[PDB]
């Protein structure tokens, strides 16, 4: 199901961070490309923790489901490595990394048309998954990767890709799900079996908030318990200073899952502004 990649062809380099029960490294893979030519291609290496090996089922399924579909806005997986005592995903290395760190580093420089253009690309990706009834389950700005920046010469827009969702929130512990508030929908915080395509409409709304809030994290100042009570009080995220998308955020973040707008209608609202 996954292309098998040789240990000897994978050189692990610098730590780039970590996700849920994973460590992330920038890497180097030696490979025969097209025409027989040998390449040294940089790769991203996602290693499942040596202590949480029980989650390997979901870990690789999440990369597997995305990999079965091919789309310009979904990150490419090259495969796994036959290491034995390790579980390593070999994924495409995106030049500029996660969108949330990028938005911090350019707070006072991303204008509204940049945020709009990134929102349309993400909504296009989500609509694609929706047509295929594939649930992502972890839509956030950390899982958005910037392939290219705005070519202020050609006025060329930024291009983004959506990374894999990682271990499902259906098997992950509550504490993890409660720290993922307000990306994890209230219904999944009440019962993780509520994971549905509507979950991705809620998380897209929270991502749109992050894209409009210069790398700021929603409910960061709130501890797990207070975040849990934010949902019990049916509260809504504060409107971003750049409030050109606050209505779409509130419409996508509807406490009633079946009232959440389709990605087709979201794209139409995104195209109506400007």
Ligand X SMILES: *S(O)(O)Oc1cccc(C(=O)n2nc(Nc3ccc(S(N)(=O)=O)cc3)nc2N)c1
CA dihedral 7, 9, 12, 13 (to 10 degrees): 170
> Binding pattern to ligand X, positions 71-90, x when CB under 6 A?
----x---------------
> Min. distance of Cβ 102 from ligand X in angstroms?
8
Does 67 bind ligand X (CB under 6 A)? Our answer is: no
Q: How far is the CB of 29 from ligand X (least distance, A)?
A: 13
Interface positions, 148-207, toward ligand X (CB under 6 A) = 163
- Nearest-angstrom CA–CA distance, 11 and 35: 23
Of 91 and 168, nearer to ligand X (C-beta) is: 91
* Of residues 26 and 120, the one with the C-beta less far from ligand X: 26
Give the nearest distance from C-beta 68 to ligand X in angstroms.
18
Residues in Cβ contact with 114 at an 8 Å cutoff, skipping those fewer than 6 apart: 150, 157, 158
- Is residue 98 near ligand X by the rule CB under 6 A? yes
Asked if 145 touches ligand X (CB under 6 A), the answer is yes
- Judged by phi (left if over 0) then psi (alpha if -120 to 50, else beta), residue 219 lies in left
213 part of the interface to ligand X, by CB under 6 A: no
**Does 93 participate in binding ligand X (rule CB under 6 A)?**
yes
Nearer to ligand X, 105 or 259 (CB): 105
Out of 44, 88, 188, 212, the residue judged to bind ligand X by CB under 6 A:
44
Site for ligand X in 2-21 (CB under 6 A): 16-19
- Residue 139 binding ligand X, by CB under 6 A: no
Binding site for ligand X (CB under 6 A): 16-19, 24, 44, 75, 91-94, 97-98, 101, 142, 145, 163
């Amino acid at each position: 199901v996954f292309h098998k990649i040789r240990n000897e062809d994978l050189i692990f380099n610098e730590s780039l961070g970590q996700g849920t029960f994973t460590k992330i490294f920038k890497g180097v893979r030696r490979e025969v490309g097209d025409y027989g030519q040998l390449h040294e291609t940089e790769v991203l290496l996602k290693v499942l923790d040596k202590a949480h090996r029980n989650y390997s089922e979901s870990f690789f399924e999440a990369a597997s489901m995305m990999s079965k579909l091919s789309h310009k806005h979904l990150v490419l997986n090259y495969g796994v490595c036959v290491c034995g005592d390790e579980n390593i995903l070999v994924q495409e290395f995106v030049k500029f990394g996660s969108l949330d760190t990028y938005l911090k580093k350019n707070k006072n420089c991303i204008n509204i048309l940049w945020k709009l253009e990134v929102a349309k690309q993400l909504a296009w990706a989500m609509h694609f998954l929706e047509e295929n009834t594939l649930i992502h389950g972890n839509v956030c700005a950390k899982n958005i990767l910037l392939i290219r920046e705005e070519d202020r010469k050609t006025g060329n827009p930024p291009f983004i890709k959506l990374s894999d969702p990682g271990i499902s929130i259906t098997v992950l512990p509550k504490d993890i799900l409660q720290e993922r508030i307000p990306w994890v929908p209230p219904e999944c915080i009440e019962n993780p079996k509520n994971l549905n395509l509507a979950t991705d409409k809620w998380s897209f709304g929270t991502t749109l908030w992050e894209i409009c809030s210069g790398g700021d994290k929603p409910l960061s100042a709130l501890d797990s318990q207070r975040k849990l009570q934010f949902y019990e009080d049916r509260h809504q995220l504060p409107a971003p200073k750049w409030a050109e998308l606050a209505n779409l955020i509130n419409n996508c973040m509807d406490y009633e899952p079946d009232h959440r707008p389709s990605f087709r209608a979201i794209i139409r609202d995104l195209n109506s502004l400007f």
